[PDB]
Structure 1
Amino acid sequence: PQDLEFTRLPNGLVIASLENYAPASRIGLFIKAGSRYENSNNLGTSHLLRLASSLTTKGASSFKITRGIEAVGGKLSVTSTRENMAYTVECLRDDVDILMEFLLNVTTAPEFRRWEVAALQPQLRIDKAVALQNPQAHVIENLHAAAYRNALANSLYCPDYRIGKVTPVELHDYVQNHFTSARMALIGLGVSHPVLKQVAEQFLNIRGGLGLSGAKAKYHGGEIREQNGDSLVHAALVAESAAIGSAEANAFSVLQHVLGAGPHVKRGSNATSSLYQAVAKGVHQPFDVSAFNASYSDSGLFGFYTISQAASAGDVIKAAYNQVKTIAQGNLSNPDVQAAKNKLKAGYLMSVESSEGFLDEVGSQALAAGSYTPPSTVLQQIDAVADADVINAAKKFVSGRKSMAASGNLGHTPFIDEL
């Protein structure tokens, strides 16, 4: 009924709200600290920070925090990316208040106690181990540290050597510099904006400029190769995408989808995916491949991802390249761009068809832009992409510094000079 309602304060923190119909409300304070905010000396700190959400804080003891949310059946999620750190908080309409006071302690009143922080430590390993079970994570991580030099090249998981070395003043410092007013954006999916603001005003007024971590971007082509014993090999080939929320970017996204192979059908094969077709024809029976597309504030990464077997690595890898070269040679017919587009458009809408989705979308926008762009408008922008435009972007991957990451038996994985 009522649409969202942004509001930038004197501090510069955004806040939105949508009194929905349904029973479940979800707040989520998105602070602007990503992994990119640590240095050589501070790497691994967000990670631990992320895992230390239920520790004692100034107004609520680790026990009350946990037992409290349990009391009411609430969930507290603490999600991060290379650029941002969403601190989600779900619960029942009636219990927001008990919950909110929890979110506020966790985030503005953390008390990292030598003893508490210390017992966590070991959790980092356990967490790293469980997320490093998907080749995608170690490759995708390897990719970012190869392709960048300094900031976004920092990984989300703490480096093995750092684990126990994460000290309490580190955590305290990171919160202090990054968990501040200018970098924050409250977001409610079932709360009153009037009452939201009041609270925001009372509890979210802290000072801290950007880049006390060392903000800045930079792209550097590079290759990280990880040999294994596994039959299968994964590798990523990616060139500087266009930046976040800009036209070039957007173009990339559309291009991405013309090749982009994220199955829309169970047990079904893509007819639409060019990459898949081209790869497929020159490739063996079992294999899988898809268009990769990442976009951040000050840089992007576009290119593809492959999963081939030992001997097929190159064949697939080049195959995929060659096909994306085709689009860069100019060869791309109108009929396919419109399909793409509609694919994209449908996806973005389904992305936001859920509370969780919507809440992310909104906060996300509040840290980039400073306001909420409605869907429609969104939809318009993607449509504005020219059929050429797409080609042109594509032209840029083929003619843009390469950067690859692979894993598995690398006898048959092309190097930079190979392609």
Structure 2
Amino acid sequence: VPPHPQDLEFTRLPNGLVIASLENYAPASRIGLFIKAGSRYENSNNLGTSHLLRLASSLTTKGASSFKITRGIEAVGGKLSVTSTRENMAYTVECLRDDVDILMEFLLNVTTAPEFRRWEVAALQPQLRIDKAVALQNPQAHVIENLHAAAYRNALANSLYCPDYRIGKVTPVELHDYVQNHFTSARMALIGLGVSHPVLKQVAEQFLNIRGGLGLSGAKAKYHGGEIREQNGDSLVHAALVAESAAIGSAEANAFSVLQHVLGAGPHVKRGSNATSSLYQAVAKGVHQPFDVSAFNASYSDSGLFGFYTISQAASAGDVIKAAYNQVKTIAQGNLSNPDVQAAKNKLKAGYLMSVESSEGFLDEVGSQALAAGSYTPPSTVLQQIDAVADADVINAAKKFVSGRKSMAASGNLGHTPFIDEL
């Protein structure tokens, strides 16, 4: 006999801040401040400022020194973590119920009263290099960073990691400017799990009433296309082929999500042949062994990148890519079932529900929703949204991929990795 639940309470304040909270009678609490401040708001003169920022969540703040933040949080055994994507920056804090108040205070201090002292920021610069080196050991992170650089001329092209030439040069004034102008009410969302709506609402009306920054979701991502190639000798070539798709929230995005599942995202079975994966079976048929494929799908506020990603021996890259591309073509030419889309719908829906099974998952989903849409869309209607996707919507997305100006990034021994020209 589990307790009857509770509904999420949602509220837009007139200054544009949004507040969302669920009272699950959990032993722990979770509070995250979602801010539209990702790397896409950086420009040519301050690339990397959002990285250093992301790494500075525990520098001294008015009201709370570094030592206090570190010692105060660890004394109740909570966490303070900050996570970024090209569009948002999210500060989440976690701890047992009885300790929300202090964590709440540290959160407010980090996001709204950072001091960014000269010496403390100076000591933090080398972290950019350690942080960056650790992310870059996954060949994926290079590729995807090069993919965006190649696809966009603008905002989403920015890297989520500080460019090498800026390590050591981002200044305290550049952080203050980044905060005063992006961490404002109309670009923020305060989500809570294990707290109550009045409390969040109280905290928001008292402390999150900041405004005088910029305005909307962008300068506008202008998609352009092109290709970046990084010779490497890794024995395995990583390549990603992609075209402009659709912005998040639009009906068309859902079609792409369903296409991603018709083609193939990750695996469902440990050490499996991946039978229902259109791309995989298509590459496997004519390529004999070490390899991987998956549809790739990224959607943002004002654009989207859809296509596929491949990993394969250096000499088979061309073949893997060409088979993968031809598979998409086959879907774009009408050769799509109905139970396939049905299976895809089921893979996608099961996955979404799975993605919000836990607190961490739920919370991030609620925060991003608040920023992207200004609403909270219950699992029922998301499943309903997915169901409205017709077979023709899926076919139409494939057709959009097949004929759009392409974008590509690839790393490895590129000697047999085709150039787009040749696709």
Would the TM-score normalized by the shorter structure come out above 0.5?
yes
Conserved 8 A contact 1:261-1:275: no
The C-alpha deviation readout for 1:205-229, integer Å capped at 9, x for no partner, is 0113435996221101110000002
Task: Determine whether 1:9 maps to 2:13.
Answer: yes
Aligned counterpart, 1:229: 233
In structure 2, the CA distance between the partners of 1:213 and 1:170, relative to structure 1 (3 Å rule), is: farther
Conserved 8 A contact 1:227-1:408: yes
Secondary structure at 2:168's aligned position in 1?
Answer: helix
Q: Distance in 2 between matches of 1:269 and 1:322?
A: 20
Unaligned residue ranges in structure 1 (runs of 5+): none
Aligned counterpart, 1:325: 329
Conserved 8 A contact 2:328-2:398: yes
Secondary structure at 2:142's aligned position in 1?
Answer: helix
The C-alpha deviation readout for 1:138-186, integer Å capped at 9, x for no partner, is 0000000000001000010000000100100000000000000000100
The C-alpha deviation readout for 1:328-354, integer Å capped at 9, x for no partner, is 111111110000000000000000011
Deviation at 1:10, TM superposition (A): 1.6
Conserved 8 A contact 1:38-1:213: no
Task: Determine whether 1:254 maps to 2:248.
Answer: no
In structure 2, the CA distance between the partners of 1:358 and 1:122, relative to structure 1 (3 Å rule), is: same
Secondary structure at 2:12's aligned position in 1?
Answer: coil
Q: Distance in 2 between matches of 1:292 and 1:216?
A: 22
Alignment RMSD, CA only? Answer: 1.1
Conserved 8 A contact 1:55-1:62: yes
Q: Distance in 2 between matches of 1:260 and 1:343?
A: 10
Deviation at 1:261, TM superposition (A): 3.4
Conserved 8 A contact 2:236-2:413: yes
In structure 2, the CA distance between the partners of 1:344 and 1:141, relative to structure 1 (3 Å rule), is: same
Q: Distance in 2 between matches of 1:202 and 1:269?
A: 56
Conserved 8 A contact 2:76-2:99: yes
Q: Distance in 2 between matches of 1:212 and 1:287?
A: 42
Conserved 8 A contact 2:217-2:301: no
Equivalenced residues, count: 419
The C-alpha deviation readout for 1:70-109, integer Å capped at 9, x for no partner, is 0000000100000001100000100000110000000100
Q: Distance in 2 between matches of 1:152 and 1:132?
A: 19
Q: Distance in 1 between matches of 2:355 and 2:216?
A: 34
Deviation at 1:17, TM superposition (A): 1.1
Conserved 8 A contact 2:144-2:409: yes
Q: Distance in 1 between matches of 2:110 and 2:265?
A: 40
Secondary structure at 2:9's aligned position in 1?
Answer: coil
Aligned counterpart, 2:412: 408
Deviation at 1:361, TM superposition (A): 0.6
Conserved 8 A contact 2:180-2:213: no
Q: Distance in 1 between matches of 2:308 and 2:263?
A: 9
Percent of aligned positions that are identical: 100
Secondary structure at 2:10's aligned position in 1?
Answer: coil
Deviation at 1:360, TM superposition (A): 0.5
Deviation at 1:9, TM superposition (A): 0.7
Q: Distance in 1 between matches of 2:216 and 2:241?
A: 32
Conserved 8 A contact 2:265-2:296: no
Conserved 8 A contact 1:25-1:90: yes
In structure 2, the CA distance between the partners of 1:246 and 1:214, relative to structure 1 (3 Å rule), is: closer
Unaligned residue ranges in structure 2 (runs of 5+): none
- TM-score of the superposition, structure 1-length normalised? 0.99
Q: Report the more deviating stretch, 206-215 or 132-141.
A: 206-215
The C-alpha deviation readout for 1:275-306, integer Å capped at 9, x for no partner, is 00010001121111110000001000000000
Deviation at 1:388, TM superposition (A): 1.2
Q: Distance in 2 between matches of 1:269 and 1:82?
A: 34
Aligned counterpart, 1:341: 345
In structure 2, the CA distance between the partners of 1:78 and 1:272, relative to structure 1 (3 Å rule), is: same
Q: Distance in 2 between matches of 1:190 and 1:21?
A: 7
Q: Distance in 2 between matches of 1:165 and 1:143?
A: 25
Q: Which contiguous aligned blocks of 4+ residues in structure 1 show a shift greater than 6 angstroms?
A: none
Q: Distance in 2 between matches of 1:82 and 1:211?
A: 17
Conserved 8 A contact 2:187-2:215: no
Deviation at 1:267, TM superposition (A): 1.1
Q: Distance in 1 between matches of 2:231 and 2:12?
A: 49
Aligned counterpart, 1:201: 205
Q: Distance in 2 between matches of 1:74 and 1:272?
A: 42
Q: Distance in 2 between matches of 1:402 and 1:298?
A: 18
Q: Distance in 1 between matches of 2:275 and 2:298?
A: 24
Q: Distance in 2 between matches of 1:210 and 1:198?
A: 25
Q: Distance in 1 between matches of 2:178 and 2:133?
A: 24
Q: Distance in 1 between matches of 2:332 and 2:6?
A: 46
Deviation at 1:398, TM superposition (A): 0.5
Q: Distance in 2 between matches of 1:403 and 1:217?
A: 14
Conserved 8 A contact 1:149-1:219: yes
Q: Distance in 1 between matches of 2:261 and 2:245?
A: 14
The C-alpha deviation readout for 1:240-287, integer Å capped at 9, x for no partner, is 011111111110000110011311011112000010001000112111
Q: Distance in 1 between matches of 2:64 and 2:191?
A: 22
The C-alpha deviation readout for 1:371-419, integer Å capped at 9, x for no partner, is 1110000000001001111011100100101111000000101101101
In structure 2, the CA distance between the partners of 1:213 and 1:240, relative to structure 1 (3 Å rule), is: closer
Q: Distance in 2 between matches of 1:208 and 1:266?
A: 51
